[model samples]
Target: NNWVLLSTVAAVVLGITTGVLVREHSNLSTLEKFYFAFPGEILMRMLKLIILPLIISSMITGVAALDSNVSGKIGLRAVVYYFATTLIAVILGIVLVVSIKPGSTVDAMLDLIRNMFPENLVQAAFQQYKTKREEYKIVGMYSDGINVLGLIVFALVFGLVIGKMGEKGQILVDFFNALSDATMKIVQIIMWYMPLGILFLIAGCIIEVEDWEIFRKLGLYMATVLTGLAIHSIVILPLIYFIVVRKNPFRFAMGMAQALLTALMISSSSATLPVTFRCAEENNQVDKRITRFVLPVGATINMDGTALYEAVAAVFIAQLNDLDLGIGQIITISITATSASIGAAGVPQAGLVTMVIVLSAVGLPAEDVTLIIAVDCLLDRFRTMVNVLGDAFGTGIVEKLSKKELEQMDVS
Candidate 1:
């Protein structure tokens, strides 16, 4: 197990070094392309294939096993915790970005970001999902991880319906419960290639970048985003842990250390869910009922780090373009940042997709995303850790709250 962690760290360095070398020298041979492309492609498909079933089986089993009333409490608590923390994270990110205002007077990069999303491109990205989401005829499109909200809503319907079944439901619930375990086995096998996958992912990521100067140019903005993430992960979450959870957060964190490390290296919270579930159930004392329900949903919608990063990045882009955001616009950024965070995938730079939605909502340039994309892989390591921790926090808190509620019921 520790070897897995060691392997991931080693792979990241190897990939980063390899990617930079490829970037510097330019021109990968056909063989080199084939070698690099296959690992990443295989890994991505493996990760995607597992996410849909893992979520579906996990949600349905968790919901079906719990009492209907406890189901509501868990649902309500998970959403409230995810939403509140996300709002707090956005607020903190906005404060830091506003105070730091980390942008340069670089016009070329800013202009590229501004022009990246012509009106036609924006429509192409969103029009179908937008119209179909409202039109009410969307069907199995919900099964893919692309439609996370759809999957969650779809699972909840299945979960609640199965929970209501009499003795017969147990057969179906047990099937899903076993399926969840089997799916995790599949996850483990794919993960055997993880450290292997990390090399390909990170290498491929770095090769995509043309100019490394984007780092020097965007250095201040990068620091600002990191600063906010560190504060959230280190200061805010720990302080709340001490006061609210009655246990040391980092100890709880280390219980899930492997998951966190993997999240940092992988930069995909969606892919990290399997490891997180094990930590929540096996290491921490959180119940399966909680992990099965809270953590999966947390992975789906609870993106504190991604939301905070977006708020800071979006405002930083605005400031760079010499566009001063009014307090009203800043408030709108907070709202939109939280909204965009809701259904973002856990993959590298997936947040960039919804970030376009945030930029559009606030009347900022959607084109500025390339700048974030330029550095997001590096920054994603940190934010993905926060994202994993956020899910951890929710699982722990729900266990605590649900325990108290169950105790009171016993008293009654």
Candidate 2:
């Protein structure tokens, strides 16, 4: 079991070293590089394949097995954790970036409502309603991507209604429980394959980066963001966990090491959910009911790392452009950072899109985003790692907070 953690760390080192050595020593064609990275690509696909079924089955079963009152309490705590931690992250980044003088300055809710109810349930799997501006008018239309928000909303209500149905609900609940377990079994198999996939994923990613010089130019900005992330994850997140959950947060974090490493390599928290679930349930002994309900929703909405990074990056760009940010605009950056992160989907480089939103709010140019893209691949991994860490801690905190309510539901 520990080897899962060991091998993954080893893969990260091996992959990066191999990428650097190979790229420096030889001139490999792009086609060959693509071929080399094919296995990793397949691994990403494998992880994604499980996401839809996993979300539906896990969310349904997690909520159905609990009393609605307890589940409601759990949901409330999860949302609180989501918003509080994200706001803290944004503030931390803002303070760091401003103090470091990394940038000159600068820097959602309605979409959640639309996403909660898909116009077509079938379309909900692959598309969600999106608002786009055309000339003088805004129009709503289906946009491609897994409508995870809509699906989570549907699963929550579906499971809640089933819990209300009493005996008849047991059949559907049992079915989803089985499906959830089956999906986790697949996750176990994937875990074993992860080191190999991670090796190539890191290697291929490194080889693809041609602008190493940009790191030198943006060194201070990167340092500021990284420092903020380190503080948020190491100090702030654990401090909250210790205060609320009354446990050793680092030990809890150790249990999540494999999943965190997977998130770093894959750069998608949703893709890393199966590993997170396994770690929380099997290693950390978090309640299954809490994990199933809170984690899927947390992965979608709770992005502390993304919020911080976007805040730092938007301000860093403004600094780069020498824009003088107003006090009102700084406050706007804080609010938009939190909301944009909430709206950000759990995927690779999702921050880029949401980052644009933060920029536009503070009147920064979208084109300036190209300046930061060079390092985002690496930063994306760290933020996603933090995102997974936040979700894991959230599960523990929610489970602990809802303990009395959860226990009361057990009696027949």
Candidate 3:
């Protein structure tokens, strides 16, 4: 059960070191400071080095393998259905948070945002401007700006071009294919240092978060988000499985246990993808075609958990600000939350950035995002589990829908 004993030990050691540093800050040597900061930076570099190539290759390969007619139909249907369901979840979350007015008791968290902006004004402005530009582009209005939509557009175009290139495409495909492999291998190499990375990241988090009593005051809001996530994980996903796959949900959950545990520990859907796909096909008997087609795309684009979080976060922030949103505005929040969910990169703290995008789309202040960042890392672990669950559920549904056709084929 404790397969990652070393990692766990590393984390506990780091936690103890951090506690020591906090209590005796003045006594820490230069080497100790470096020890505290190094792991997080290394982890960041590892993530950045692999992300671009991985996205390009995975997206292109996913699209290229599809039959054109079915590709078009399924692509259209998948996009629509994914967005629709995600939006519905977002709307439900926002409505619930707003109705409960979770922020009514707590002091407005405006000072937190003000402090963050002053600390890093230029970086904050640039990020906000980029997010605004993206929101404008998503709804088909506005000038050239970079945001999640732009990234999605770039990934989609690159994938389509790769898919369309008959023979010429092979050269380019091979290049990307090789690049992807190399990057993944690099990830493997980088993982050797993961114990250190986890140490620093967790230590930094503990140091920063131990002082924040914000959660105690905002318990209602925390409870609401937690409850929503639990409902989605325990109820909604199982219902989808039972209705669509006609299989035992518990068995499906059991098969996915390893992937779920990996997701929980790493707090990354992308990182957990290989295991998720393996479980879906090998353990769960999901069709390989469907698993291969749906899971990768879903990992990138279908994030029901993040969608729900965005909605709850936005509404909570609005309530804190005493801002009233009209029904139309609420609907817009749902739409933006769905888009943001799709656009979120599968990384730690991505939810906060994506939440900023959603808040901006609904004319809510992005600065309010700082209020949630402290707890975001912890929440990310659970959210990512839900994210992978949704991906596998969607694949199961697709597989069921195409069972008759799949039965006639030589699946091997």
lDDT of 1 by residue, 1-412 (tens): 4776788899989998988787677787656766765788788778767777777787788777667767788788888889988999999999998898897122212322332222332232222133112344432121112555555666787898888885778888889989988987887787779888888888887776666687888899988889999999888887766677799888988898878988988888878888898788889877776787888778867999999988998898888779878886688788778867876765666687777767776667768787678778788888889998998888888877788555544543
Model 3 superposed RMSD (Cα): 7.5
lDDT against true structure, model 2: 0.83
- Candidates' C-alpha lDDT: 0.76, 0.83, 0.66
Candidate rank order under lDDT: 2, 1, 3
RMSD of each: 7.2, 3.1, 7.5
lDDT of model 1, residue 391: 89
Better of 2 and 3 by lDDT: 2
What is candidate 1's CA lDDT for residue 314?
85
Kindly provide the TM-score of model 3 when superposed on the true structure, using C-alpha atoms: 0.79
For candidate 3, write residues 15-124 as lDDT tens digits: 55874477356544556655665777678667655555565566666665554435555566457556755765676677678677788001112222222233232333
Off by over 4 Å in 3: 1-37, 104-178, 404-412
lDDT (10s digit) by residue, model 2, range 1-412: 4787788789989999998998788777888889988878888787767778877887788788878667788778888999999999999999998899864122134555777888877898878665745685767777676777788888889989998798977898888889988987887788788889888988888887675787888888889988999999999999999999888999999999888877887788877888888899999998877888888878878989999998898888888878887677788788878877876777776788677667877777878788888788788989998999999999999889988877886664
